[PDB]
């Protein structure tokens, strides 16, 4: 059962943040109400671990968490509803009012990784894979299915909204990533399909397999 999500950020480690489309309206409303409240209560003592508001590069305020105070000019924040990080001065920080807390609406961005694929260890190969995914899915609406948990973030399959093509499988087909085998019996059909695409990618001498195997 695939659910619609909006992909916000792709990380250099081939993880990615998504927002649930079903709650997009609620996020929009919260932001509208938060900003109306900020406009009347113009910007707090930033400290590590604390929630705040932070003024992004579009000139708008968003919900954030303080991760590191490097100096008064360099406060490291994480935008809880989008997943991007930013270093900013104190002039771009404010109090997050209780009316807009994560109890009122949960953090809207969730970190995921692709199921059944290995993130390339070679730096340039990993860049090629990241770059593909950025071009194809960053800031677009996709379909998502949670496959399995891990000692880390959950792993998922994504589908393109239009073609319904499996995104991670696309990477394997292109020879941009290798397959990550799992033992669960319910994953055997999909893993066999991924291994089949990988072998075909190897025979076509694409990307990772350009010079053979």
């Amino acid at each position: 059962s695939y659910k619609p999500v909006f992909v916000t950020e792709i990380t250099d480690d081939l993880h990615f943040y998504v927002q649930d489309v079903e709650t997009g309206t609620q996020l929009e409303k919260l932001m509208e109400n938060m900003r109306n409240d900020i406009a009347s209560h113009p910007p707090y003592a930033p400290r590590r671990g604390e929630f705040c508001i932070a003024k992004f590069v579009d000139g708008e305020w968003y919900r954030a968490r303080v991760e590191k105070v490097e100096s008064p000019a360099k406060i490291h924040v994480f935008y809880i509803d989008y997943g991007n990080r930013e270093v900013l001065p104190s002039t771009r920080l404010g109090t997050l009012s209780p009316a807009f807390s994560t109890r009122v609406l949960p953090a809207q961005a969730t970190e995921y990784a692709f199921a059944f694929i290995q993130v390339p260890q070679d730096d340039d190969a990993r860049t090629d894979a990241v770059d593909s995914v950025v071009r194809d899915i960053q800031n677009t609406q996709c379909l998502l299915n949670v496959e399995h948990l891990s000692a880390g973030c959950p792993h998922v399959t994504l589908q393109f909204a239009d073609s319904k093509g499996d995104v991670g499988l696309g990477l394997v087909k292109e020879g941009l990533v290798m397959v990550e085998v799992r033992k669960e019996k319910q994953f055997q059909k999909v893993i066999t399909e991924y291994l089949n695409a990988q072998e075909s990618a190897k025979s076509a001498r694409l990307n990772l397999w350009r010079y053979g195997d």
Binding site: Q19, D58, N139
Partner: peptide, 6 residues
């Protein structure tokens, strides 16, 4: 506007 102008 989901891309935030980006």
């Amino acid at each position: 506007g989901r891309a935030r102008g980006q």
